[PDB]
């Protein structure tokens, strides 16, 4: 019916994907061993979206972890829920791409793609009807940012009708850890805009601020980013695995999030982020929820929405409420904030409500929106990409791998093509 496979590429995708399979498995009460150890019946009804039944009641994740370096597998195999995975889903090579997009996309990737494609073919056939595909990768690496786009490129040709979604991690100029990071990004975004139904841009730096200010953790680690995205990752799919007062799924959003096929980039949000001190003075209500979604100290992207007008807004709410105010505050936030929403689309907001709360919490919500703020994140990329390219800097590996100079000129044209018509969609009259 509605089944999702969880592709997993690169070191950034692996840790996020691994910590994700942690998060849901408590929501379904599945042990490290892998048997059913929940309480309620609803906690075990729709595991078939992410889990495949095995003999004796064992449940296995539906995921394929891919990396050019086998060390990240060893980092994944041996964690808390490390061994739950399929012993043959790990497909890996002996040399890494070294953050080099071309080596992952062309040189070394061409040999590992076939072994990955058979495994996903087996898992695609294993379930009767697939709703979509799911894959996490950073845009500043070489394995996930590289071969992963090749994996998406092939798989659309195989399965065109299904949903392809990715949680791409976008590099931030303020804190950057790769000298060739924009080069990999500008080569990757062109792969994305051609082939993806939806995309969420996640920036580490926005999580760095959220950890520092909203939650006020003294020493956050890289588990903070992974856990916060994983909870967001589970929120967008709760209305699938679980019944709600108002139902939705990925395609329900997908039809309603994408006004034109080129615009599929979104900013994620999660409402109940409060520091341990702040818990003492807070009566759990929905008015402060919508307050906590819409203040943009909550965005996980690095683009302020006050600069860019909101096109389409969606907020999926998790927990048992009534809705007369979630329609009122819907209407309330739209009317008085007139200037920040597009005019040719009134009733800019779309909602989903799922009756089942998260573990450890009463109310929860996940916010996704399409806005003109994201155009600031692309035109900043051209600001450093052009700096390296005008001097042909750091070129000799990509040139030495066998491709030409044209591929960079085409990517920037399409990158500039996107923002120019995006700028047009900012400046249009109703």
């Amino acid at each position: 019916m509605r089944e999702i496979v969880h592709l997993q590429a690169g070191q950034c995708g692996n840790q996020i994907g691994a910590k994700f399979w942690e998060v849901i498995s408590d929501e379904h009460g599945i042990d490290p061993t892998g048997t059913y150890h929940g309480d309620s019946d609803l906690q075990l009804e729709r595991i078939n979206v992410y889990y495949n039944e095995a003999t004796g009641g064992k449940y296995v994740p539906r995921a394929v972890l891919v990396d050019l370096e086998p060390g990240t597998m060893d980092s994944v195999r041996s964690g808390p829920f490390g061994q739950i995975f399929r012993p043959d889903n790990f497909v890996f090579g002996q040399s890494g791409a070294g953050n080099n997009w071309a080596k992952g996309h062309y040189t070394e990737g061409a040999e590992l793609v076939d072994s990955v494609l058979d495994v996903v073919r087996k898992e695609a056939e294993s379930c009767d009807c697939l709703q979509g595909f799911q894959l996490t990768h950073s845009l500043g690496g070489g394995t996930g940012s590289g071969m992963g786009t090749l994996l998406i490129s092939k798989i659309r040709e195989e399965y065109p009708d299904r949903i392809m979604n990715t949680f791409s991690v976008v590099p931030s100029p303020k804190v950057s850890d790769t000298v060739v990071e924009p080069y990999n990004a500008t080569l990757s975004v062109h792969q994305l805009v051609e082939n993806t139904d939806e995309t969420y841009c996640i920036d580490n730096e926005a999580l760095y601020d959220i950890c520092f200010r909203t939650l006020k953790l003294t020493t956050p680690t890289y588990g903070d980013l992974n856990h916060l995205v994983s909870a967001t990752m589970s929120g967008v799919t709760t209305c699938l695995r679980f019944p709600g007062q108002l139902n939705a799924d990925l395609r329900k959003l997908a039809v309603n999030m994408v006004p034109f096929p080129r615009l599929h980039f979104f900013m994620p949000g999660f409402a109940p982020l409060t520091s341990r001190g702040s818990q003492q003075y807070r009566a759990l209500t929905v008015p402060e929820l919508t307050q906590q979604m819409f203040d943009a100290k909550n965005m996980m992207a690095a683009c302020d929405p006050r600069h860019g007008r909101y096109l389409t807004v969606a907020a999926v709410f998790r927990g048992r409420m009534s809705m007369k105010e979630v329609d009122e505050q819907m209407l309330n936030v739209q009317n008085k904030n007139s200037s920040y929403f597009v005019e040719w689309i009134p009733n800019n907001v779309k909602t989903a409500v799922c009756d089942i709360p998260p573990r450890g919490l009463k109310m929860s919500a996940t916010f996704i929106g399409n806005s003109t703020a994201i155009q600031e994140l692309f035109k900043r990329i051209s600001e450093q990409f052009t700096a390296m390219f005008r001097r042909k800097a750091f070129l000799h590996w990509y040139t030495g791998e066998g491709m030409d100079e044209m591929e960079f000129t085409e990517a920037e044209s399409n990158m500039n093509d996107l923002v120019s018509e995006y700028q047009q969609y900012q400046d249009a009259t109703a």
């Binding site: 009460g29 042990d31 490290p32 061993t33 150890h37 929940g38 309480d39 309620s40 095995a54 003999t55 004796g56 064992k58 060893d74 195999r77 041996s78 964690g79 808390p80 490390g82 061994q83």
Partner: protein, 376 residues
Amino acid sequence: PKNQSERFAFIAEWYDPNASLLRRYELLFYPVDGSVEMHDVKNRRTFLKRTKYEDLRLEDLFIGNKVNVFSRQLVLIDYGDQYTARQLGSRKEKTLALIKPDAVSKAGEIIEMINKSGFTITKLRMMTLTRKEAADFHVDHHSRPFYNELIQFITSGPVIAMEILRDDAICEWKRLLGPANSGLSRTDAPGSIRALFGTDGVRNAAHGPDTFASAAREMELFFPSSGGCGPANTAKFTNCTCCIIKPHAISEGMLGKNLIAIRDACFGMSAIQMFNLDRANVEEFYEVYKGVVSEYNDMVTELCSGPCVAIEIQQSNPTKTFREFCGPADPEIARHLRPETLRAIFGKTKVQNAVHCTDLPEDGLLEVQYFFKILD
């Protein structure tokens, strides 16, 4: 970390029910930070990272223990190396602690005195030894005088049987006993078991093992490693309810204190034995509690997390409702309204109530039977 300092290791065993094969693993512990590791043996991989496991402590590192590591009930079967044997377990030893039938009422005080002296109880059961089993104990006394008197006293009451593990346990457990003649013991020092409650040399409280060779003989007589339990349980399945002293209360050394608070309440203690049941037996017992309470698996986890003691509470006194003596399930509401309940005197977090007791009156015999007929 730095892969340095104390890094002791044991040999783990896990019964994988799906594969239906016993698998042996490399168990690793780092006492400096309390962290845990585990690696595959045959596949030459790493089973489990260096993550801390506060649920696993240095007190749990010994052979024949059922620890719970990431929901894997692990039995440690062998010292993983030489250097773990030299530091952790060179001189810790296991010795029998029988309590003769005179002092069975004083058990809850003596078990407290056992816990204060650092001993750790591993096997626990009350027994009724036959005459032939009694003669097997006193084989060393067959030539020696008063053989019949020594036999006649010992098979005249429900003998208590314990096994205590500690460093230098054989010497300390004999030292805690004091002189065998109870009259001599009071003159020597009242701070012994045979002096506080003992009356005469024949009716001293305990007659623990003396040497290693003597110890190994008697330990198999009571607690057979072969599984052929010799002395039958003293469990009269009549007008009774069962009480489980939960593992969290065991580790904090309240085992004797809970036993004291039952005996003075004029409740008959017909039967008491320790069972280190696994999760599957926990699910069968708590099968009725599945679904009604919103924390079934948390309630499941605590019983199999450590050692628990099941007690058959005989129904007596003009007021017999042991159900109310335990009191409200949450200790906090117990503390707020009815502090005289055990779940307020020995209260803790909501799950960590002092004991578990039967709720429906009909389920008393069934839960007694499941714990003292099939599991026994």
